[PDB]
Amino acid sequence: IIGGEFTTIENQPWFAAIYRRHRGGSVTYVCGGSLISPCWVISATHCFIDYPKKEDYIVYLGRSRLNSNTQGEMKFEVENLILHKDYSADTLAHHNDIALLKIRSKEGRCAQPSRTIQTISLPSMYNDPQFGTSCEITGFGKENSTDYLYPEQLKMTVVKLISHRECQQPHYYGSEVTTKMLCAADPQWKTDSCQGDSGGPLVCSLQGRMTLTGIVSWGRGCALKDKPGVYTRVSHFLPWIRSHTKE
């Protein structure tokens, strides 16, 4: 997250921290994710497409810090890694960038709700906030494009939803952005998500209720003028989510 303010996992109880195991013992941060139910973590396919290997992943819930423990955090293994079969990556755009991680503790349990671990509501069929609505994004992504390391503390910022018409303008993204995607940036281009934030949540208050409206997917640079962050439009993938989460 470029700019924005440092936060805790009490303010973003649905945020999951996904890490990948390595040969030797080194664990590195992969992507963010969201807890949509106690045995499911949504996230983006581009995060795992190169290493489809569920045993290599570790998911943390209730964790505020990158490389250190948080009282009340819970560690989970990945029981099932579901990637979207129609996923593809173009010059900049990532299509059908959505994934599901069935989680389970070493005891075989799923997440246990607490003040630091809570689920986020999914949207209704084709029901998104009006364009111009303020929404929040959270993540352990880069603070600056020139950084090679990620911040140690979780961050968050507020961005505004941008219409498909504006985002489809030539100076923006043109025809690269589709209706299955959502743009969203700061009117001053000062804050935005960045590398490392992928898979994280784009949360919008929809009728008094926190809803998971988008998933951090792609963008040209970070906080660049006329180059909004692009998110996977969650409301357009409800049938896919429901079918893979049943049994």
mmCIF file of C-alpha atoms in Angstrom:
data_model
loop_
_atom_site.group_PDB
_atom_site.id
_atom_site.type_symbol
_atom_site.label_atom_id
_atom_site.label_comp_id
_atom_site.label_asym_id
_atom_site.label_seq_id
_atom_site.Cartn_x
_atom_site.Cartn_y
_atom_site.Cartn_z
ATOM 1 C CA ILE A 1 0.000 0.000 0.000
ATOM 2 C CA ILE A 2 1.395 3.383 -1.135
ATOM 3 C CA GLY A 3 0.611 6.058 1.444
ATOM 4 C CA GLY A 4 -2.360 5.358 3.683
ATOM 5 C CA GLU A 5 -1.966 4.744 7.479
ATOM 6 C CA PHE A 6 -0.464 1.539 9.447
ATOM 7 C CA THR A 7 -3.294 -0.432 11.053
ATOM 8 C CA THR A 8 -3.995 -3.607 13.067
ATOM 9 C CA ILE A 9 -5.660 -6.923 12.484
ATOM 10 C CA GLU A 10 -8.633 -5.719 14.867
ATOM 11 C CA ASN A 11 -9.599 -3.137 12.253
ATOM 12 C CA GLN A 12 -9.341 -5.722 9.420
ATOM 13 C CA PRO A 13 -10.311 -9.068 11.115
ATOM 14 C CA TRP A 14 -11.063 -10.785 7.754
ATOM 15 C CA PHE A 15 -7.628 -10.191 6.171
ATOM 16 C CA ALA A 16 -5.546 -13.534 5.694
ATOM 17 C CA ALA A 17 -1.712 -13.524 5.296
ATOM 18 C CA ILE A 18 -0.625 -16.156 2.707
ATOM 19 C CA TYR A 19 2.982 -17.442 2.835
ATOM 20 C CA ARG A 20 4.876 -20.105 0.877
ATOM 21 C CA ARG A 21 7.298 -22.694 2.297
ATOM 22 C CA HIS A 22 10.731 -23.260 0.760
ATOM 23 C CA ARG A 23 13.418 -25.938 0.606
ATOM 24 C CA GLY A 24 15.417 -25.458 3.783
ATOM 25 C CA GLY A 25 13.074 -23.559 6.069
ATOM 26 C CA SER A 26 12.597 -20.103 4.561
ATOM 27 C CA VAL A 27 9.045 -18.756 4.453
ATOM 28 C CA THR A 28 8.219 -15.822 2.175
ATOM 29 C CA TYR A 29 5.077 -13.699 1.852
ATOM 30 C CA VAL A 30 2.979 -14.430 -1.232
ATOM 31 C CA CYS A 31 -0.333 -12.553 -1.214
ATOM 32 C CA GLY A 32 -3.234 -11.298 0.833
ATOM 33 C CA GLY A 33 -6.651 -12.905 1.096
ATOM 34 C CA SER A 34 -10.040 -12.659 2.808
ATOM 35 C CA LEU A 35 -11.956 -14.969 5.151
ATOM 36 C CA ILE A 36 -15.428 -15.441 3.624
ATOM 37 C CA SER A 37 -16.415 -18.331 5.913
ATOM 38 C CA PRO A 38 -14.738 -20.298 8.773
ATOM 39 C CA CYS A 39 -13.095 -23.171 6.031
ATOM 40 C CA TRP A 40 -12.556 -20.724 3.061
ATOM 41 C CA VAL A 41 -10.065 -17.817 2.280
ATOM 42 C CA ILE A 42 -10.754 -16.097 -1.082
ATOM 43 C CA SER A 43 -7.581 -14.605 -2.931
ATOM 44 C CA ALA A 44 -6.212 -14.315 -6.516
ATOM 45 C CA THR A 45 -5.158 -17.110 -8.873
ATOM 46 C CA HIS A 46 -2.088 -15.260 -10.191
ATOM 47 C CA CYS A 47 -0.629 -15.652 -6.702
ATOM 48 C CA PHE A 48 -0.390 -19.453 -6.962
ATOM 49 C CA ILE A 49 -0.523 -20.303 -10.699
ATOM 50 C CA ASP A 50 3.262 -20.879 -10.891
ATOM 51 C CA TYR A 51 3.376 -23.111 -7.777
ATOM 52 C CA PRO A 52 -0.011 -24.983 -7.610
ATOM 53 C CA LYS A 53 1.488 -26.821 -4.738
ATOM 54 C CA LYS A 54 -1.162 -26.697 -1.723
ATOM 55 C CA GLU A 55 1.288 -28.285 0.767
ATOM 56 C CA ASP A 56 3.735 -25.382 0.159
ATOM 57 C CA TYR A 57 1.309 -22.813 1.577
ATOM 58 C CA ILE A 58 0.670 -21.424 5.049
ATOM 59 C CA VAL A 59 -2.229 -19.102 5.908
ATOM 60 C CA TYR A 60 -2.307 -16.847 8.953
ATOM 61 C CA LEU A 61 -5.416 -15.245 10.416
ATOM 62 C CA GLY A 62 -5.374 -12.619 13.169
ATOM 63 C CA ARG A 63 -1.826 -11.573 12.199
ATOM 64 C CA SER A 64 -0.966 -7.873 12.164
ATOM 65 C CA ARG A 65 2.858 -8.280 11.400
ATOM 66 C CA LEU A 66 4.794 -9.779 8.513
ATOM 67 C CA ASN A 67 7.689 -11.640 10.141
ATOM 68 C CA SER A 68 6.585 -11.740 13.776
ATOM 69 C CA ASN A 69 3.831 -13.281 15.903
ATOM 70 C CA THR A 70 0.605 -11.615 17.041
ATOM 71 C CA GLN A 71 -1.171 -12.787 20.405
ATOM 72 C CA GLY A 72 -4.376 -14.631 19.176
ATOM 73 C CA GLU A 73 -3.115 -15.492 15.658
ATOM 74 C CA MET A 74 -3.955 -18.855 14.112
ATOM 75 C CA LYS A 75 -1.887 -20.831 11.595
ATOM 76 C CA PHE A 76 -3.546 -22.965 8.881
ATOM 77 C CA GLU A 77 -2.539 -25.506 6.250
ATOM 78 C CA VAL A 78 -4.223 -25.528 2.839
ATOM 79 C CA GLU A 79 -6.592 -28.477 2.470
ATOM 80 C CA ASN A 80 -7.662 -27.508 -1.050
ATOM 81 C CA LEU A 81 -6.320 -24.954 -3.539
ATOM 82 C CA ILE A 82 -8.915 -23.936 -6.121
ATOM 83 C CA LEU A 83 -7.750 -21.860 -9.090
ATOM 84 C CA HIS A 84 -10.058 -20.520 -11.807
ATOM 85 C CA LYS A 85 -9.740 -22.757 -14.883
ATOM 86 C CA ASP A 86 -10.245 -19.846 -17.285
ATOM 87 C CA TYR A 87 -7.442 -17.714 -15.813
ATOM 88 C CA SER A 88 -5.134 -15.930 -18.272
ATOM 89 C CA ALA A 89 -2.682 -13.031 -18.223
ATOM 90 C CA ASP A 90 -2.283 -10.469 -20.991
ATOM 91 C CA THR A 91 0.101 -7.501 -21.361
ATOM 92 C CA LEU A 92 -1.154 -5.983 -18.100
ATOM 93 C CA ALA A 93 -4.571 -7.472 -17.383
ATOM 94 C CA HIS A 94 -5.241 -10.635 -15.419
ATOM 95 C CA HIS A 95 -8.529 -12.329 -16.277
ATOM 96 C CA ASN A 96 -10.636 -14.475 -13.924
ATOM 97 C CA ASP A 97 -8.094 -13.637 -11.216
ATOM 98 C CA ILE A 98 -9.833 -15.319 -8.312
ATOM 99 C CA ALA A 99 -8.980 -18.310 -6.137
ATOM 100 C CA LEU A 100 -10.293 -20.264 -3.174
ATOM 101 C CA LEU A 101 -8.192 -21.601 -0.148
ATOM 102 C CA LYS A 102 -9.866 -24.333 1.953
ATOM 103 C CA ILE A 103 -8.076 -24.038 5.294
ATOM 104 C CA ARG A 104 -7.570 -26.360 8.247
ATOM 105 C CA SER A 105 -5.413 -26.244 11.365
ATOM 106 C CA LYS A 106 -3.133 -29.166 12.295
ATOM 107 C CA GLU A 107 -6.065 -30.441 14.379
ATOM 108 C CA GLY A 108 -8.381 -30.397 11.356
ATOM 109 C CA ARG A 109 -10.503 -27.396 12.720
ATOM 110 C CA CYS A 110 -11.426 -24.253 10.696
ATOM 111 C CA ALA A 111 -11.180 -20.642 11.849
ATOM 112 C CA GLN A 112 -12.628 -19.756 15.243
ATOM 113 C CA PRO A 113 -14.160 -16.225 15.284
ATOM 114 C CA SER A 114 -12.707 -13.691 17.716
ATOM 115 C CA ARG A 115 -11.952 -9.963 18.013
ATOM 116 C CA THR A 116 -9.066 -10.479 15.579
ATOM 117 C CA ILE A 117 -10.615 -13.124 13.309
ATOM 118 C CA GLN A 118 -13.942 -12.457 11.559
ATOM 119 C CA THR A 119 -15.552 -13.184 8.194
ATOM 120 C CA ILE A 120 -16.568 -10.634 5.554
ATOM 121 C CA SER A 121 -19.861 -10.673 3.700
ATOM 122 C CA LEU A 122 -20.003 -11.441 -0.013
ATOM 123 C CA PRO A 123 -22.075 -9.202 -2.348
ATOM 124 C CA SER A 124 -25.462 -10.048 -3.878
ATOM 125 C CA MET A 125 -25.977 -11.015 -7.549
ATOM 126 C CA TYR A 126 -24.700 -8.089 -9.639
ATOM 127 C CA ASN A 127 -25.069 -5.703 -6.699
ATOM 128 C CA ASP A 128 -22.119 -3.318 -6.465
ATOM 129 C CA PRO A 129 -21.762 0.142 -4.870
ATOM 130 C CA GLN A 130 -22.400 3.217 -7.021
ATOM 131 C CA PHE A 131 -19.327 4.601 -8.775
ATOM 132 C CA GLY A 132 -17.647 7.284 -6.694
ATOM 133 C CA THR A 133 -18.166 5.281 -3.494
ATOM 134 C CA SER A 134 -15.296 5.184 -1.003
ATOM 135 C CA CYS A 135 -13.817 1.755 -0.231
ATOM 136 C CA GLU A 136 -10.821 0.417 1.702
ATOM 137 C CA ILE A 137 -7.919 -1.853 0.775
ATOM 138 C CA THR A 138 -5.533 -3.640 3.130
ATOM 139 C CA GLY A 139 -2.186 -5.359 2.689
ATOM 140 C CA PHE A 140 1.506 -5.962 3.372
ATOM 141 C CA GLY A 141 2.453 -4.709 -0.104
ATOM 142 C CA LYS A 142 5.230 -2.265 -1.104
ATOM 143 C CA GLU A 143 5.115 1.261 0.359
ATOM 144 C CA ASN A 144 7.065 2.674 -2.612
ATOM 145 C CA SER A 145 7.749 1.351 -6.132
ATOM 146 C CA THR A 146 11.492 1.509 -5.421
ATOM 147 C CA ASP A 147 11.248 -0.633 -2.276
ATOM 148 C CA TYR A 148 12.444 -4.263 -2.499
ATOM 149 C CA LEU A 149 11.161 -5.130 0.985
ATOM 150 C CA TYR A 150 7.610 -5.119 2.379
ATOM 151 C CA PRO A 151 6.519 -3.182 5.508
ATOM 152 C CA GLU A 152 6.522 -5.094 8.804
ATOM 153 C CA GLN A 153 3.136 -3.727 9.882
ATOM 154 C CA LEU A 154 -0.164 -4.138 8.019
ATOM 155 C CA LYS A 155 -1.414 -1.062 6.133
ATOM 156 C CA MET A 156 -4.706 0.274 4.823
ATOM 157 C CA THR A 157 -5.975 3.115 2.688
ATOM 158 C CA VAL A 158 -9.158 4.484 1.165
ATOM 159 C CA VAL A 159 -9.793 4.716 -2.572
ATOM 160 C CA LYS A 160 -12.822 5.595 -4.685
ATOM 161 C CA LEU A 161 -14.575 3.389 -7.230
ATOM 162 C CA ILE A 162 -14.203 4.522 -10.845
ATOM 163 C CA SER A 163 -16.752 3.760 -13.575
ATOM 164 C CA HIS A 164 -16.057 1.373 -16.472
ATOM 165 C CA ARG A 165 -16.427 4.311 -18.904
ATOM 166 C CA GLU A 166 -13.661 6.352 -17.257
ATOM 167 C CA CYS A 167 -11.344 3.396 -16.762
ATOM 168 C CA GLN A 168 -11.855 2.350 -20.414
ATOM 169 C CA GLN A 169 -10.606 5.755 -21.648
ATOM 170 C CA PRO A 170 -7.471 5.694 -23.874
ATOM 171 C CA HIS A 171 -5.204 7.428 -21.321
ATOM 172 C CA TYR A 172 -6.320 4.959 -18.650
ATOM 173 C CA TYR A 173 -6.534 1.288 -19.670
ATOM 174 C CA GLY A 174 -8.637 1.322 -22.818
ATOM 175 C CA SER A 175 -10.249 -2.000 -23.745
ATOM 176 C CA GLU A 176 -7.925 -3.948 -21.426
ATOM 177 C CA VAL A 177 -10.382 -3.582 -18.527
ATOM 178 C CA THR A 178 -13.589 -5.624 -18.714
ATOM 179 C CA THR A 179 -16.959 -5.639 -16.961
ATOM 180 C CA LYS A 180 -15.674 -8.455 -14.728
ATOM 181 C CA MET A 181 -13.198 -5.934 -13.311
ATOM 182 C CA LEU A 182 -13.452 -2.844 -11.077
ATOM 183 C CA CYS A 183 -11.111 0.322 -11.219
ATOM 184 C CA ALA A 184 -10.652 2.327 -8.127
ATOM 185 C CA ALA A 185 -8.051 4.944 -7.178
ATOM 186 C CA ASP A 186 -7.319 8.114 -5.242
ATOM 187 C CA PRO A 187 -8.984 11.452 -7.190
ATOM 188 C CA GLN A 188 -5.228 12.836 -6.302
ATOM 189 C CA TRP A 189 -3.275 9.692 -7.305
ATOM 190 C CA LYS A 190 -1.421 9.701 -3.972
ATOM 191 C CA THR A 191 -2.488 6.350 -2.527
ATOM 192 C CA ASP A 192 -2.983 2.918 -4.095
ATOM 193 C CA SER A 193 -2.281 -0.782 -3.680
ATOM 194 C CA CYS A 194 1.045 -2.103 -5.002
ATOM 195 C CA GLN A 195 3.184 -5.243 -5.421
ATOM 196 C CA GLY A 196 2.505 -7.613 -2.537
ATOM 197 C CA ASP A 197 -1.076 -6.400 -2.037
ATOM 198 C CA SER A 198 -2.479 -8.806 -4.643
ATOM 199 C CA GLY A 199 -5.255 -11.107 -3.449
ATOM 200 C CA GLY A 200 -6.129 -8.647 -0.709
ATOM 201 C CA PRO A 201 -9.619 -7.216 -0.141
ATOM 202 C CA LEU A 202 -11.371 -4.161 -1.547
ATOM 203 C CA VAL A 203 -14.072 -3.585 1.076
ATOM 204 C CA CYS A 204 -17.047 -1.277 0.571
ATOM 205 C CA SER A 205 -19.802 -0.409 3.026
ATOM 206 C CA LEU A 206 -22.897 -1.558 1.142
ATOM 207 C CA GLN A 207 -26.200 -0.583 3.102
ATOM 208 C CA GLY A 208 -24.644 -0.276 6.647
ATOM 209 C CA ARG A 209 -22.675 -3.657 5.922
ATOM 210 C CA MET A 210 -18.983 -4.361 5.123
ATOM 211 C CA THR A 211 -18.888 -6.220 1.816
ATOM 212 C CA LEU A 212 -16.022 -7.835 -0.107
ATOM 213 C CA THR A 213 -16.467 -5.946 -3.388
ATOM 214 C CA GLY A 214 -13.165 -6.649 -5.082
ATOM 215 C CA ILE A 215 -9.899 -8.547 -4.939
ATOM 216 C CA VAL A 216 -6.570 -6.802 -5.622
ATOM 217 C CA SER A 217 -5.572 -7.998 -9.114
ATOM 218 C CA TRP A 218 -3.428 -5.663 -11.247
ATOM 219 C CA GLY A 219 -2.298 -2.200 -12.239
ATOM 220 C CA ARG A 220 0.329 -0.266 -14.176
ATOM 221 C CA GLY A 221 2.907 0.894 -11.655
ATOM 222 C CA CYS A 222 1.714 2.102 -8.250
ATOM 223 C CA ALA A 223 -0.170 5.336 -7.561
ATOM 224 C CA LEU A 224 0.514 6.482 -11.138
ATOM 225 C CA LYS A 225 -1.699 9.211 -12.615
ATOM 226 C CA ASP A 226 -4.545 7.830 -14.754
ATOM 227 C CA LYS A 227 -3.535 4.262 -13.875
ATOM 228 C CA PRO A 228 -6.076 2.996 -11.280
ATOM 229 C CA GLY A 229 -5.797 -0.218 -9.349
ATOM 230 C CA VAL A 230 -7.847 -2.940 -11.028
ATOM 231 C CA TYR A 231 -9.825 -5.430 -8.940
ATOM 232 C CA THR A 232 -11.653 -8.675 -9.654
ATOM 233 C CA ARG A 233 -15.395 -7.941 -9.526
ATOM 234 C CA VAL A 234 -16.498 -10.403 -6.828
ATOM 235 C CA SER A 235 -20.237 -10.008 -7.505
ATOM 236 C CA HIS A 236 -19.653 -11.444 -10.994
ATOM 237 C CA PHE A 237 -18.132 -14.652 -9.613
ATOM 238 C CA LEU A 238 -20.832 -15.701 -7.112
ATOM 239 C CA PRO A 239 -21.925 -18.816 -9.077
ATOM 240 C CA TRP A 240 -18.300 -19.951 -9.283
ATOM 241 C CA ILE A 241 -17.757 -19.291 -5.561
ATOM 242 C CA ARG A 242 -20.930 -21.135 -4.517
ATOM 243 C CA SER A 243 -20.183 -24.174 -6.702
ATOM 244 C CA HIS A 244 -16.634 -24.654 -5.373
ATOM 245 C CA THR A 245 -17.483 -24.048 -1.704
ATOM 246 C CA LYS A 246 -20.291 -26.609 -1.269
ATOM 247 C CA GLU A 247 -18.672 -30.069 -1.190
#
